Amino acid sequence: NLGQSLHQEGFSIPLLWLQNCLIRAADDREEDGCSQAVPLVPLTEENEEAMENEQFQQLLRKLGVRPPASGQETFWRIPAKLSPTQLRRAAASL
Amino acid sequence: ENLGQSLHQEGFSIPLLWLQNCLIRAADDREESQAVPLVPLTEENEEAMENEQFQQLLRKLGVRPPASGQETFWRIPAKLSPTQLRRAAASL
Structure with a gap:
């Protein structure tokens, strides 16, 4: 639980965004030949x-x-x- | 305008047009104000x-x-x- 200290410091929303970025990238990369770097764009x-x-x-x-x-x-x-x-x-x- | 033309010649025309549109959208918004970020996507x-x-x-x-x-x-x-x-x- 590497995120725990940051959660306690009030970063739950950016952590959820980071989590989704990681998971969405994983889903895309399950297809062979598909592996692109993804920029983390803070919106x-x-x-x-x-x-x-x-x-x-x-x-x-x-x-x-x-x-x-x-x-x-x-x-x-x-x-x-x-x-x-x-x-x-x-x-x-x- | 001179500095912009120099950047046009160095290959930055597409980002210059993006910047142009960002400035114009901010202008339109402020007639209808807050500082707004330039977000390169x-x-x-x-x-x-x-x-x-x-x-x-x-x-x-x-x-x-x-x-x-x-x-x-x-x-x-x-x-x-x-x-x-x-x-x-x-x-x-």
Whole structure:
């Protein structure tokens, strides 16, 4: 339950968004030949705040999410190399 | 307009047109106000938003960088009037 400290700090809504991103990516990757990196696009002020939070970023790295390429990208990415199983395990871990 | 044309020649025409439309939509919204983010949803618009020359243009048009540690996105400030926004868009 890696998410627990962030839940207690009030980040349940951004954590739910992160969870859905991981699960949706897993579903897409169950098809052979289909594996695209997914940008984590914060679409609300609350999710923006989470993406700029150091503790939330630490969780992202632990789950295997990669930071943006500086000078090229704005968004963190769910790397293409992660399998549906790896992704679902990350989501299940919070 | 000169800075924009230079970015057009460096291959940023598509993000410039996106930026143009964002400014115009903000202008329309403010006639009918709050600061609104510039949200790049494509790799190409992301690349522009992270480019130093493109950022120099944003600053000249009156767009402000994100608040460090709080925001991800650049903002179109509330202080820009619809008239200012349309003039900015018209320069590209």
